[PDB]
Amino acid sequence: PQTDPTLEWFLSHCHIHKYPSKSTLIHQGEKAETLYYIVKGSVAVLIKDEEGKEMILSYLNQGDFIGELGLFEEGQERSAWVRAKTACEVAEISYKKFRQLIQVNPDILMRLSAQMARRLQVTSEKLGNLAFLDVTGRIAQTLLNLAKQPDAMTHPDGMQIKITRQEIGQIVGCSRETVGRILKMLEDQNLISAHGKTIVVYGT
Amino acid sequence: DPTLEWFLSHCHIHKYPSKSTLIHQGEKAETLYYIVKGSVAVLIKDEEGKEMILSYLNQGDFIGELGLFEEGQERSAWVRAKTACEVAEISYKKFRQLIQVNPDILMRLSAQMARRLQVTSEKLGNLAFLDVTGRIAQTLLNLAKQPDAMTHPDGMQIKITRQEIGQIVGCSRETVGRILKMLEDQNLISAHGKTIVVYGT
Numbered sequence: 054p055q056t057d058p059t060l061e062w063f064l065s066h067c068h069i070h071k072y073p074s075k076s077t078l079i080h081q082g083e084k085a086e087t088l089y090y091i092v093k094g095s096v097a098v099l100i101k102d103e104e105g106k107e108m109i110l111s112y113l114n115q116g117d118f119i120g121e122l123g124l125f126e127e128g129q130e131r132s133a134w135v136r137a138k139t140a141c142e143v144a145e146i147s148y149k150k151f152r153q154l155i156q157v158n159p160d161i162l163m164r165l166s167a168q169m170a171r172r173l174q175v176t177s178e179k180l181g182n183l184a185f186l187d188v189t190g191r192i193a194q195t196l197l198n199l200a201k202q203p204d205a206m207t208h209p210d211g212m213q214i215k216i217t218r219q220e221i222g223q224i225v226g227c228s229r230e231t232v233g234r235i236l237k238m239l240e241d242q243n244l245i246s247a248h249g250k251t252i253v254v255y256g257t
Numbered sequence: 258d259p260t261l262e263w264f265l266s267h268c269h270i271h272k273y274p275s276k277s278t279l280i281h282q283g284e285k286a287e288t289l290y291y292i293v294k295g296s297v298a299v300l301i302k303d304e305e306g307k308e309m310i311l312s313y314l315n316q317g318d319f320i321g322e323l324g325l326f327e328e329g330q331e332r333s334a335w336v337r338a339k340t341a342c343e344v345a346e347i348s349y350k351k352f353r354q355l356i357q358v359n360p361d362i363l364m365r366l367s368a369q370m371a372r373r374l375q376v377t378s379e380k381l382g383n384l385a386f387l388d389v390t391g392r393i394a395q396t397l398l399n400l401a402k403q404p405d406a407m408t409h410p411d412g413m414q415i416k417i418t419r420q421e422i423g424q425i426v427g428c429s430r431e432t433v434g435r436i437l438k439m440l441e442d443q444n445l446i447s448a449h450g451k452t453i454v455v456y457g458t
């Protein structure tokens with residue numbers, strides 16, 4: 054189901070706010086004191102390497118918590134930027150108020166922690182993929198994963214997505230021009246087709 | 258610490274010699290662990306069995322937590338004792354009951370999951386754009402940046418073999434060997450013995 058009494062009980066203690074596409078909701082390095090929850094829309098989580106190249110860590114969607122990593126220890130800073138990808142409606146609540154809720158009904162912490170565990174798995178797998186997959190394998194895996202994001206439109210030949218070469222590069226950790234060359238190959242190999250800011254993935 | 262005591266008194270604690278596999282990747286997850294004493298390595302590997310260490314965990318760390326929140330999860334990684342270990346253990350089902358009495362125990366587990374997410378994301382962002390040379394270089398450069406470093410005429414000095422490097426980055430032993438040799442021939446490092454001087458800093 055989309056939601057449930059526990060989530061709605063939780064949401065009743067929150068203020069829900071709207072953000073236009075491309076808003077930065079969370080800035081890296083700032084003090085964390087607030088927990089968020091996506092009621093509609095999607096965001097990208099961003100970090101940088103030591104040279105200041107931007108990497109897209111994750112997409113997060115409706116039903117996902119954000120800003121949860123500061124909850125657990127005093128005086129923590131936001132680990133990453135979070136930017137709207139889509140017009141967003143986002144519930145929000147102070148860590149203070151959320152800690153009470155946790156005592157009232159620990160399941161709400163269970164819900165949150167299920168997401169942190171999944172994130173650690175997913176993020177660990179990407180790490181492994183740096184070393185175990187080659188760049189072509191990583192782009193291809195990325196196309197496969199994008200293909201089952203909840204925003205992926207349906208098509209006679211498989212899932213259609215919309216993403217720039219730039220964005221694919223930032224997800225995988227390679228340049229825009231490398232993505233360019235590789236997509237060209239992939240479709241010349243009739244595994245995908247790519248006309249527009251928009252790509253059809255066969256199978257999925 | 259009243260809460261850890263309480264939690265431990267509901268576990269069974271066992272001893273494992275250095276080098277035991279505590280957790281096997283792919284196996285069905287139903288049990289939670291907690292390191293009472295000792296250190297462990299958390300590892301993944303490809304179809305060739307190139308290993309990559311995701312992390313070390315130490316005394317006071319939970320392990321095998323990631324299957325707790327959904328039925329029928331498999332273990333995401335191998336976990337291997339690095340020293341001799343004393344490891345407490347508890348069924349997920351009984352850990353769920355403890356969480357009902359005192360959610361603070363889940364606060365402590367989740368705090369660690371958050372620290373691990375932060376560390377692992379950092380490594381990903383820091384390595385993703387590098388090739389295997391970059392990643393071996395940065396690794397060396399980072400040990401020059403830690404406490405275990407001696408000084409030198411030419412720069413910082415470090416101890417570590419080719420296996421150990423292969424693990425930080427994900428690559429074979431022969432590949433590390435080739436790249437250390439290149440780096441040496443390009444006079445960025447010296448391999449005097451099976452230790453390494455990193456020229457700079």
Ligand SMILES: Nc1ncnc2c1ncn2[C@@H]1O[C@@H]2COP(=O)(O)O[C@H]2[C@H]1O
Pocket residue numbers: 079085098110111118119120121122123124130131132133134135172176374378
């Ligand atoms: N590896 C990741 N995967 C998914 N989301 C993340 C990841 N790293 C950080 N975030 C999110 O981005 C947020 C940045 O602010 P916090 O660290 O408070 O909480 C963080 C998480 O909600």
Ligand SMILES: Nc1ncnc2c1ncn2[C@@H]1O[C@@H]2COP(=O)(O)O[C@H]2[C@H]1O
Pocket residue numbers: 173174177280286299311312319320321322323324331332333334335336373377
């Ligand atoms: N990136 C990581 N950092 C630290 N520990 C991890 C990481 N990935 C997996 N683990 C630990 O390794 C365990 C393997 O079994 P589980 O997936 O049950 O729980 C996992 C975590 O306890």
